Amino acid sequence: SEIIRVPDIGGDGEVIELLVKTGDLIEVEQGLVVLESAKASMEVPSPKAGVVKSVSVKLGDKLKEGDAIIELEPAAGAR
Known part of the structure; x- marks a missing residue:
């Protein structure tokens, strides 16, 4: 699986x-x-098309570039 942190905003x-x-x-x-x-x-x-595995952020909370958001679990392979 791979985690998705804040994108490039500036x-x-x-x-x-x-x-x-x-x-x-x-x-x-x-x-x-x-x-x-x-x-x-x-x-x-x-x-990424997968199932939410874990959450590293909360709604209403503020984060800065570099902060992880959530981790999607696409499994080993699909289709």
């Missing part, structure tokens, strides 16, 4: 709400969370 990212659960199988396409920026709102969908 400042501080803040979590507004978490619309995902643990053990939930997402798909490369749907959204995952909504971070905020100095003067703009961004989004973070599922960068």
Whole structure:
């Protein structure tokens, strides 16, 4: 599996709400969370089709570039 830390933004990212659960199988396409920026709102969908294995962040909590968000478990192989 691989963990997904904050992407390349250039400042501080803040979590507004978490619309995902643990053990939930997402798909490369749907959204995952909504971070905020100095003067703009961004989004973070599922960068990998797998099931939520663990969570290293909380909703409403603020994190800085380099902070891990969640870990997707795509298993060994798929299809």
